[PDB]
């Protein structure tokens, strides 16, 4: 119960919050702003999404696929393509917690 365990996503146990982010950034940088994410990586993204309270709002009727597209300038982010034909975006950076360490 009260135990600081490693960050588990889709079975993958990361020894750090920044460690989980690294994995996502690696594959992210390996795609272009118009390419579809592989089913393997997508399966990870699904569980990485579901671990957020906004899950129902982001997903809607269901996840169809994930596309890598620009967030603002040069930066890449994962877009959720819904089965209804719509789309959404989520900031993977907050996969675990902020805990005041959000530096300004």
UniProtKB/TrEMBL annotation:
It comes from the Bacteria. InterPro entries: DCL-like (IPR044673). Pfam families: DUF3223 (PF11523). PANTHER family: PROTEIN EMBRYO DEFECTIVE 514. This is DUF3223 domain-containing protein. It comes from Rhodospirillum rubrum (strain ATCC 11170 / ATH 1.1.1 / DSM 467 / LMG 4362 / NCIMB 8255 / S1).
